[PDB]
Amino acid sequence: APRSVDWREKGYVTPVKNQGQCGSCWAFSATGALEGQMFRKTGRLISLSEQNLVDCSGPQGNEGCNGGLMDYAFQYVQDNGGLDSEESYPYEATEESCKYNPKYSVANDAGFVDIPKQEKALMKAVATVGPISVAIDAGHESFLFYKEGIYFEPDCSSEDMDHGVLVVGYGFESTESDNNKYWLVKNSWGEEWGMGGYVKMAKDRRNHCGIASAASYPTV
Amino acid sequence: APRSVDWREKGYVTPVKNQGQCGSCWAFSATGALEGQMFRKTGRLISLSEQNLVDCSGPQGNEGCNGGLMDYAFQYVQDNGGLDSEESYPYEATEESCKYNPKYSVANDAGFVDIPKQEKALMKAVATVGPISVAIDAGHESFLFYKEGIYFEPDCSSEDMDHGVLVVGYGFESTESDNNKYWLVKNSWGEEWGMGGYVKMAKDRRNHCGIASAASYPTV
Amino acid sequence: APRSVDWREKGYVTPVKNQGQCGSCWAFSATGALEGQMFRKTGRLISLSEQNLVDCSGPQGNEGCNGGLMDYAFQYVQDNGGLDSEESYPYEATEESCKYNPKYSVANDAGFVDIPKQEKALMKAVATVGPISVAIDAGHESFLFYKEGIYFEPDCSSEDMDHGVLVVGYGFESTESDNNKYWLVKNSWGEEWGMGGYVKMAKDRRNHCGIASAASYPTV
Amino acid sequence: APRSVDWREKGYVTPVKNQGQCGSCWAFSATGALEGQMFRKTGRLISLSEQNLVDCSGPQGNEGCNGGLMDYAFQYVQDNGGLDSEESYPYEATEESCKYNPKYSVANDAGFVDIPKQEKALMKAVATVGPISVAIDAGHESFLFYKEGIYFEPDCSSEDMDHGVLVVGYGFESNNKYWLVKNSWGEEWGMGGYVKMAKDRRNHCGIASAASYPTV
Numbered sequence: 075a076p077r078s079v080d081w082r083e084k085g086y087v088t089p090v091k092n093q094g095q096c097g098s099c100w101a102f103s104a105t106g107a108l109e110g111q112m113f114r115k116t117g118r119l120i121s122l123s124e125q126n127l128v129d130c131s132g133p134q135g136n137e138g139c140n141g142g143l144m145d146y147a148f149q150y151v152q153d154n155g156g157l158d159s160e161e162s163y164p165y166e167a168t169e170e171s172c173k174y175n176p177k178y179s180v181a182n183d184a185g186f187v188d189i190p191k192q193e194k195a196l197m198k199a200v201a202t203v204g205p206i207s208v209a210i211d212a213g214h215e216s217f218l219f220y221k222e223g224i225y226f227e228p229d230c231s232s233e234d235m236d237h238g239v240l241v242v243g244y245g246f247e248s249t250e251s252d253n254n255k256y257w258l259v260k261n262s263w264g265e266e267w268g269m270g271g272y273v274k275m276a277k278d279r280r281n282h283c284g285i286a287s288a289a290s291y292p293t294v
Numbered sequence: 295a296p297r298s299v300d301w302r303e304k305g306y307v308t309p310v311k312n313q314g315q316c317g318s319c320w321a322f323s324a325t326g327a328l329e330g331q332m333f334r335k336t337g338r339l340i341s342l343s344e345q346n347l348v349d350c351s352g353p354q355g356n357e358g359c360n361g362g363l364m365d366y367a368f369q370y371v372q373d374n375g376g377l378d379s380e381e382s383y384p385y386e387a388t389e390e391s392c393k394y395n396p397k398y399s400v401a402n403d404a405g406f407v408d409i410p411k412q413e414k415a416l417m418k419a420v421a422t423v424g425p426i427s428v429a430i431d432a433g434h435e436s437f438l439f440y441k442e443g444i445y446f447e448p449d450c451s452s453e454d455m456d457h458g459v460l461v462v463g464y465g466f467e468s469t470e471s472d473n474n475k476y477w478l479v480k481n482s483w484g485e486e487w488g489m490g491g492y493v494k495m496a497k498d499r500r501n502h503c504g505i506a507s508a509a510s511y512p513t514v
Numbered sequence: 515a516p517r518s519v520d521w522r523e524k525g526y527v528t529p530v531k532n533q534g535q536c537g538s539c540w541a542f543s544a545t546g547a548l549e550g551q552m553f554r555k556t557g558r559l560i561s562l563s564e565q566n567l568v569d570c571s572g573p574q575g576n577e578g579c580n581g582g583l584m585d586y587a588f589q590y591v592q593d594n595g596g597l598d599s600e601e602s603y604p605y606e607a608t609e610e611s612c613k614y615n616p617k618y619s620v621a622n623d624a625g626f627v628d629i630p631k632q633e634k635a636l637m638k639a640v641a642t643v644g645p646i647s648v649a650i651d652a653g654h655e656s657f658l659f660y661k662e663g664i665y666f667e668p669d670c671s672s673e674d675m676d677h678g679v680l681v682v683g684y685g686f687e688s689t690e691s692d693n694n695k696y697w698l699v700k701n702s703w704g705e706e707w708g709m710g711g712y713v714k715m716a717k718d719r720r721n722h723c724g725i726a727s728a729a730s731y732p733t734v
Numbered sequence: 735a736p737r738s739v740d741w742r743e744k745g746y747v748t749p750v751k752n753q754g755q756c757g758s759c760w761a762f763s764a765t766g767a768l769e770g771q772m773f774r775k776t777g778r779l780i781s782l783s784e785q786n787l788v789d790c791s792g793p794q795g796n797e798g799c800n801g802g803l804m805d806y807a808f809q810y811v812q813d814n815g816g817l818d819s820e821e822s823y824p825y826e827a828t829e830e831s832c833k834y835n836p837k838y839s840v841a842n843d844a845g846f847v848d849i850p851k852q853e854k855a856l857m858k859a860v861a862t863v864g865p866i867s868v869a870i871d872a873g874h875e876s877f878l879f880y881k882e883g884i885y886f887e888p889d890c891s892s893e894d895m896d897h898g899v900l901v902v903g904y905g906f907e908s909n910n911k912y913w914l915v916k917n918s919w920g921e922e923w924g925m926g927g928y929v930k931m932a933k934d935r936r937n938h939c940g941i942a943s944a945a946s947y948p949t950v
């Protein structure tokens with residue numbers, strides 16, 4: 075795998091979005107991964123509807139603003155035969171009745187891939203697939219307050235995660251250092267948070283915050 | 295809860311045993327769970343005597359090679375004040391008169407805990423307690439020839455279990471059908487059955503084969 | 515197409531063979547497809563010589579134990595006007611000079627058909643033609659160690675195939691509505707590999723492992 | 735010696751591990767043997783760091799994912815004064831700079847013992863010492879494809895071995911005696927990651943030709 079990857083430079087990544095006061099991180103993680111795989115397959119980046127997922131993917135196990143899983147969202151898109159664009163089905167930050175319209179569907183998948191629980195496997199997937207949905211332990215105020223640098227939280231759990239985000243790349247401190255490698259992570263808390271909405275998470279430090287424990291992407 | 299658990303890596307689990315042609319699965323389930331809880335307490339992993347349970351726990355309700363319940367076994371160990379080591383009271387695969395000797399007792403318990411009949415509760419117990427005794431519907435040919443992968447039997451019953459086994463963890467792996475989650479289950483049919491004597495039972499598929507319907511562990 | 519196909523039950527397929535430590539998979543894929551089409555034409559199944567292809571089809575672009583293409587093998591049979599039987603020209607697992615003898619030729623073809631690169635087209639061809647030559651990404655340890663069930667490898671590529679094999683059918687496991695679908699694939703690593711030398715490969719997951727990317731059959 | 739031995743039943747053996755796509759078998763053989771001897775000495779079974787060996791035992795002669803010797807790994811632990819736990823220094827399946835931390839050392843050794851190149855000597859060692867590091871000729875597809883039974887490969891070499899593994903016991907049919915061998919290719923391979931190798935058949939696959947264990 076290359077020593078660094080940034081899928082934003084290849085056109086796979088939409089701008090940073092903001093879930094608001096709704097626990098819909100899973101939907102933003104899922105649309106991010108499906109935006110990337112649709113671009114891989116079609117050469118077109120089209121922003122996708124988190125509201126569609128919040129309102130409509132209950133049958134696959136999701137619970138709207140009360141939480142969900144990226145894999146359930148990927149299952150919804152398969153079962154449903156499509157997913158509407160962000161433009162056609164804009165985000166409201168609260169759960170509503172489903173208003174899916176197939177005429178505005180711009181994405182599809184045939185299931186999903188769960189990556190094995192190894193940071194080496196996550197690296198290979200980021201390098202060769204595109205942006206990857208991951209879950210992390212973001213339940214520490216250090217994450218809430220993050221502004222810049224390589225995020226490392228001594229109390230982070232590698233097994234108990236609470237926040238779905240999107241790995242769009244990875245990098246290093248210098249070509250010859252094992253220190254302060256990082257995953258480049260797109261969050262969904264707006265661009266004020268962090269580094270324009272992004273965080274560099276510690277990479278190859280014993281699966282820090284569980285970033286490799288629930289990594290997946292849709293089959294496209 | 296954690297997305298993956300394997301108590302074998304923490305030292306809680308003895309090697310796979312073989313009940314032979316005796317219907318004593320309940321006793322192997324019980325010794326497995328007690329081995330785990332005793333290790334949790336003392337840091338010593340000591341294989342426990344299934345024969346002691348087969349021969350001696352009739353008063354609690356068990357019926358030797360003709361079946362029994364893990365909770366009855368846990369009750370016996372409490373009522374009896376002890377349980378002999380496997381080395382001291384070896385397995386003969388046929389019921390005989392009770393030969394318990396307190397001098398060779400290496401385990402105790404103070405009762406047991408029954409888990410609510412939901413896979414969500416079983417997962418919380420596995421994640422926080424250790425290996426858990428469970429009963430499954432194992433009366434299908436597919437269960438005999440199992441070699442690898444996630445076991446799913448469409449004819450499996452969630453209410454009528456016939457086999458006591460031990461959940462030592464859970465996890466996931468990508469599959470064709472995207473039913474990726476499994477319980478890691480220790481069987482007592484020897485190393486040549488299944489994956490070194492283990493089976494990955496379908497997890498979060500409507501309580502498949504009843505794995506969450508009679509789950510419990512001893513209190514140590 | 516039919517819901518399931520197994521050309522072995524119709525007499526189209528020879529026993530599993532073993533290429534040894536020679537990169538001649540392409541020749542075994544090609545003989546398998548030609549064995550099927552010759553059976554379709556004549557009603558007689560005759561095992562065909564991979565060694566003939568390894569030794570003789572260089573002019574069409576093949577490179578013996580260093581790799582080849584099934585289409586180049588079909589072109590050789592057409593150019594050459596024949597291919598010898600396995601019995602007359604047995605397999606040696608190393609490249610040698612060409613000893614084709616037309617007296618022992620038992621097959622011919624008039625070219626080949628490349629199937630469109632998607633799995634609906636591949637299924638139609640398997641259902642209406644017979645066994646189909648395909649290439650897959652077999653370059654993972656999971657493939658070496660495959661035992662039973664439907665092979666799904668998260669890191670499988672749909673573009674970078676390295677191994678020529680033979681699709682002899684397809685079908686499904688479990689309840690049909692679970693979409694637990696597979697391709698039935700004959701390998702050439704002997705009957706100790708896999709399921710008697712066969713593997714069930716993930717079907718209808720967007721061309722998993724590239725099984726539809728280089729599919730063809732000979733015209734007889 | 736006893737007719738059969740299985741050190742797994744005595745608590746000497748950690749679960750099966752997976753070296754991945756790195757030629758670090760020697761390091762898994764070494765940690766396996768040191769795990770057994772550390773348990774023999776202390777009563778604690780603690781998984782040990784193959785990555786520590788891969789990254790750090792170059793001065794003893796090892797070459798990371800490009801190969802090594804179990805004896806060189808045992809020499810490193812002695813020279814270094816310790817070896818980190820698996821938990822503190824987990825496996826990355828690629829060679830990097832050495833990150834050994836003495837505060838997380840959980841193992842030590844005082845050298846190593848090479849066993850004479852005879853299966854009778856190997857049996858005595860397994861019976862009296864615990865799990866033994868060995869090297870075998872695993873360069874045959876029959877070994878890649880192994881699933882069950884007593885492994886025997888007519889083309890195996892007794893002198894040219896390429897794979898470090900761990901003998902955790904031995905047994906008998908009731909002919910076809912076997913060594914119980916723990917591999918490091920994960921649980922799917924073989925019998926839950928184990929293989930029964932032919933025992934007392936002219937040093938099949940060289941299993942007695944490079945056997946050793948650490949002194950603790």
Ligand SMILES: *[C@H](CS(=O)(=O)c1ccccc1)[C@H](CCc1ccccc1)NC(=O)[C@H](Cc1ccccc1)NC(=O)N1CCN(C)CC1
Nearest residue numbers: 097099100135136137140141142209212235236237238288
């Ligand atoms: C989003 C994370 S968050 O809201 O942005 C947040 C806030 C502060 C700190 C950290 C993170 C949601 C939050 C859901 C929630 C709502 C209300 C109260 C508590 C939580 N997180 C999830 O949806 C997680 C994501 C996840 C994915 C994969 C693996 C692990 C976690 N999932 C979740 O909460 N679930 C999952 C399943 N089920 C359908 C409901 C519970």
Ligand SMILES: *[C@H](CS(=O)(=O)c1ccccc1)[C@H](CCc1ccccc1)NC(=O)[C@H](Cc1ccccc1)NC(=O)N1CCN(C)CC1
Nearest residue numbers: 317318319320359360361362429432433455456457458508
């Ligand atoms: C072990 C199961 S088994 O023998 O390994 C087996 C074999 C083949 C297929 C599936 C399982 C025993 C079998 C008892 C038996 C022997 C001979 C004829 C009929 C039955 N199973 C039990 O002991 C079960 C386990 C169990 C525990 C908890 C909840 C549900 C089931 N229990 C059991 O059979 N009994 C009968 C008598 N006893 C007092 C109460 C429960």
Ligand SMILES: *[C@H](CS(=O)(=O)c1ccccc1)[C@H](CCc1ccccc1)NC(=O)[C@H](Cc1ccccc1)NC(=O)N1CCN(C)CC1
Nearest residue numbers: 537539540575576577580581582649652675676677678728
């Ligand atoms: C057989 C595959 S294999 O040897 O059985 C194997 C072993 C282990 C894992 C996976 C597969 C050959 C291998 C050729 C090879 C030899 C030595 C080093 C590297 C490779 N594979 C081929 O022959 C492939 C098959 C193929 C067909 C169609 C599309 C894609 C792949 N072709 C190949 O390797 N070529 C083709 C062209 N040219 C003549 C040589 C390179």
Ligand SMILES: *[C@H](CS(=O)(=O)c1ccccc1)[C@H](CCc1ccccc1)NC(=O)[C@H](Cc1ccccc1)NC(=O)N1CCN(C)CC1
Nearest residue numbers: 757759760795797799800801802869872895896897898944
């Ligand atoms: C592990 C064996 S393996 O990779 O798992 C494997 C794979 C397939 C089939 C069989 C085995 C390593 C492999 C090293 C390697 C990597 C890349 C290319 C070639 C080789 N094997 C070793 O490390 C062996 C083990 C050994 C120990 C004792 C006696 C004999 C063999 N040793 C080795 O390769 N050395 C020794 C010393 N020197 C430092 C480098 C070469």
